[PDB]
Amino acid sequence: GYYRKNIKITVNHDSGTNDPCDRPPPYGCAIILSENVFVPPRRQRCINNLEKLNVDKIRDKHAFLADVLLTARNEGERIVQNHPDTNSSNVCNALERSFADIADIIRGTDLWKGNSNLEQNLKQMFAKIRRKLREDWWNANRQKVWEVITCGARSNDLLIKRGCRKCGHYEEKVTKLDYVPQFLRWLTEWIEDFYREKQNLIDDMERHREECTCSTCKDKCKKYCECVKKWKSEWNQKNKCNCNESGIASVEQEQIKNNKNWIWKKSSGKEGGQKEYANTIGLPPRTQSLCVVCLDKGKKTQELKNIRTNSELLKEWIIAAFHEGKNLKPDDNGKKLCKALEYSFADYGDLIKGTSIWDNEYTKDLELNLQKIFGKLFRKYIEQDTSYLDELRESWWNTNKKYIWLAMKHGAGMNSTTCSSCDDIPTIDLIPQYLRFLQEWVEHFCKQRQEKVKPVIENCKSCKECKTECKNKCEVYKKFIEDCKGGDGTAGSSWVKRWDQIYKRYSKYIEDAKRNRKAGTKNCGNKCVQSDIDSFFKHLIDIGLTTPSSYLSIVLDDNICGADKAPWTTYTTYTTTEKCNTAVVVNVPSPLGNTPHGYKYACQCKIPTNEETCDDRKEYMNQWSCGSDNYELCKYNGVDVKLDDKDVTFFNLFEQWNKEIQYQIEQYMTNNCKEKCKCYSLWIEKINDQWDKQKDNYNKFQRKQIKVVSLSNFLFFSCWEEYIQYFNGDTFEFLIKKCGNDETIFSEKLNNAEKKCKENESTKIKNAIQKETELLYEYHPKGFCHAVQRSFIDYKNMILGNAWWKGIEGEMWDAVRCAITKINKKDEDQSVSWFKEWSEQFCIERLQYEKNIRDACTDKIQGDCKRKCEEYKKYISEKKQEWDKQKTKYENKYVGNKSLCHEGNDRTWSKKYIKKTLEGVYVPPRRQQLCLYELFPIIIKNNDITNAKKELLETLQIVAEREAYYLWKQYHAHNDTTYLAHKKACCAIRGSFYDLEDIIKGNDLVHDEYTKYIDSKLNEIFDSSNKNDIETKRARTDWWENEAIDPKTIRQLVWDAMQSGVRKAIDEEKPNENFPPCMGVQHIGIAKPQFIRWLEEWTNEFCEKYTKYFEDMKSNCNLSNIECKKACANYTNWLNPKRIEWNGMSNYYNKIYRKSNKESEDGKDYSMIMEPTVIDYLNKCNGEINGNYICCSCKNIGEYSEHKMKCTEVYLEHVEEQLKEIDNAIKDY
């Protein structure tokens, strides 16, 4: 609900900026040593937020619902964190009592609270919506209110629901039915409070009377007796070792019977389970058969509920563990029994300390009895060393985990010296139960997979007809892997779906642990990460194990899942043939693959073809299907076909093919060698066949149309258009050099590709040259190739006044080598080389002048420093004088807190600077025009580490401010000033801030000179006397999101700098604008990966451009050769680069999703994105722009068969007139 609020189904916060819950000591019968408002309980509230409900948003009941749910959520959190009962049933009862209290508040039937001016506030809303209606409203929203109130309840909370888990949060029926009048409810809560106070006083004097002596306790009991009598008098108003002595709190420190089957459903009536963990993790068969009912399989000897001392509790637990040991009695004791005992011991641990995620209709009773026992036993422990109930359970388990382990060992026959019993206690119990269940399930699946794959690997390894050697066994393996029935591992589903559910739950843990800014990891109490799920997953994120794939790769054994090395990291792709229906491509880890790893196109009894190897090498791809009097269409693999229609469709396909093939050839010109150019020559043959087919097709087009320009004319037009669309809107010679003048160009390009393969696969004056080399050596060496090439080319130019020149050049290497041996005894190359030598000389001279001016300079500095500054300025001016001429000559040869920075609306953007593998990454223009000018001075200073950090923080602040100001000014400089422009500028500012964060954290994909110098200097700055890449990349990270420096860390500090910049933008440029709600949220979530943000920005920009262009065409065209052609050319010109960019981005995204830091490329997280394809991810763009959670607002893409004929026919006319312009373009020169 868009309200001072953001977009709130699970937990609110968010309609709370108006009035807080404060007025107020939380209430958790006052003790006496030796008003008539007694009817209301101890808890008087939680109410102030709902109080004075007269905000302008009262015409909609949804605002009232949001406010009441916020109040209920805050009340529930207060009760959960407040009520000191150490009993989940009592906490649930208190939550239900508060729910009934707010029920009577909203219904307003029996409202008796000592607040003023509340009933009128409620009646205002209930008359705007317009007391029976109030009751109907409550009976309608009861379910939602009870869902929101118990959100903060602990996971191991029990509800009696007499009329269960987590205070009845998950019941699909409100649970307790409190329709009773609050008079009896308050009386019941009062008597409960008195009884609880009596037991509290008993617990107090248990450690007081026995130690201090007595009489004072009896006096207090007497006083409470008269207090109770005084209360009841007014009640005419009724008519209206081996124990917990040690106390060890272990801290984690980790570095890099009946029928039983795997149950995955929710907690059923009597078998398996929790509701939250349903259909996302499977109970192992052992975990359901833990022998507490194992007293004698029932109770005949002695009742469980007789634990007077914790010694009895330990005895009972020891007996249970010992009887568990005998259940696994049938070497196995090193790999099977040891692991089984480890998992059973961890299960006991995680069910004693209230971490179990499974239910067996005895776990409820066991948990309730354990809570009662711990409450009645340990009271003094529940000055923060002796005093801690969950921490009490964890400490008790850690103090007595050794005896349970020994008991189960002696019960399994595993007596001693096995898996003096030195360091025998497992560390497995520390990791969360979900990870243990995942590992057990995966190792079971591996056992089955190895059993089913051993015949395959032992049969057709020679091929790494065929009756049953390998055709049949691989069929059995495929049936095992691909079957909707699943198998023993699953519970009625395919392995892929179960793995997807596991991945979803693991990613939910990863995101939940990453969002919690609470200290988590790195809390010294060495590292000493505390015993919590969030801390453990923070540690896993710090390692990089952010996916089940990599985690299982690093925790599982080796050669456990098959004789073929099937890694859990290398994802493999396959097309399903079973129901798992439609042929959907699936990417899964190698053990879950369709066929054994490395046996693709080798199990079908076929030699691996070179074409297949190139097709599965993911390199040198030409995505063109080449399906075919009729036109031999070069149909694309992705989309299929949907003046006549045939020739125009062929023309569009031919134009797209021409553009994409030219781009691919140019890229491969820009871009072990044996198979490399085997695939390269295959690609060359494919594109040559495509070119021949397209030549034939264009001949057919010309002979059938009857005119259209010739083929060469169309290619010349294409060359001109691709030149114009960098030089939008010298050049003459460059165009002559690139393409011809008044079809051969592809012949030359393919010849160039072939010779590039050949080169790659293969790989007096005559004395004056050595004299000059010796002289230059004696001058000093660095960069001698430039000197020798310049001298030789100059001498050649003088002597000449074409293999002969090449022969002379190649013959004189021997002279240079002879000169080298003698001294041991004791882009073109005419102006570009001169430019590079001049640049190197300038760089060296300027670096020397840097220290020359830094000598006596480092407030304003005068004296000697001004002389050096004046000389440096004179040198800079003199060098720039020649730099202008050098740049002009280079371009003529070929073109291919204030601050001094520019503001430039550039709409085109392609890949030019990426670290690179990194294929299909295109940097958005907003990030390309990022202002890092002011960031260079502050780190040129190279002086003190603390001063360097302070100055870097200041410069980051000013850069963020200027970037935000320019972004807001640039977006609103147009005619539009509505809310849409505000949201667009908000999203752009957020993206820029994320890009700054990634540059600081060193995760940016850009690799140009700016970021190169920035991260090169920052690596030196953030070196803590060590050169570890991980250590420095985490030291530059914790300075950002963990350096508090009232505590306003660097992230919110830079965000406030952006806010100040946008306020400066607002406060300068209808009569009075206000601060947008998005900009003032002051809360920023975890940033999505750089590529994903870039992809969303591309989608938003492309959708906006399509909406603008298509609407323009719908008016100009569809009734004309000077106005409709403009829209036609505008729409066609920008589509092809978008086609190429989308193809590259999709190709990249196909190898990103479901990857971790280790198994992916460039070592980025990339784990949170899990959608199958790029379209399936961008589909989850729907909706308008709002704040941060949504940035893309694409809509109305499909619903164009119309405006095709007219757009193409004018395009041909546009080509003819441009080629007629040759009369004044190339004819005269």
Residue numbers in the entry: 43 to 45, 47 to 50, 52 to 57, 59 to 68, 70 to 74, 81 to 86, 93 to 103, 105 to 173, ...
What does the paper behind this entry write?
VAR2CSA encoded by a subfamily of var genes from Plasmodium falciparum (P. falciparum) named as var2csa, plays a vital role in the cytoadherence of infected erythrocytes to the placenta. In this study, the VAR2CSA ectodomain from P. falciparum strain 3D7 (~306 kDa, containing six Duffy-binding-like (DBL) domains, N-terminal sequence (NTS), and multiple inter-domains (IDs))8 was recombinantly expressed and purified using the Sf9 insect cell secretory system. The cryo-EM structures of VAR2CSA ectodomain and its complex with CSA were determined at a resolution of 3.6 Å and 3.4 Å, respectively. In line with the previously proposed model, our structures showed that the core region is well-defined and covers NTS, DBL1X, DBL2X, ID2a, ID2b, DBL3X, ID3, and DBL4ε.
However, DBL5ε and DBL6ε formed a flexible wing region. As for the core region, DBL2X and DBL4ε stacked closely with ID2a, ID2b, and ID3, and formed the most stable core center, which served as a base for anchoring DBL3X and DBL1X at the top or bottom sites, respectively. First, the individual structures of four DBL domains (DBL1X, DBL2X, DBL3X, and DBL4ɛ) in the core region are quite similar to each other, with the typical “3 + 2” helix bundle shared. Uniquely, our structural study showed that CSA binding induced significant conformational changes to secure ligand binding, which was not reported by these two works.
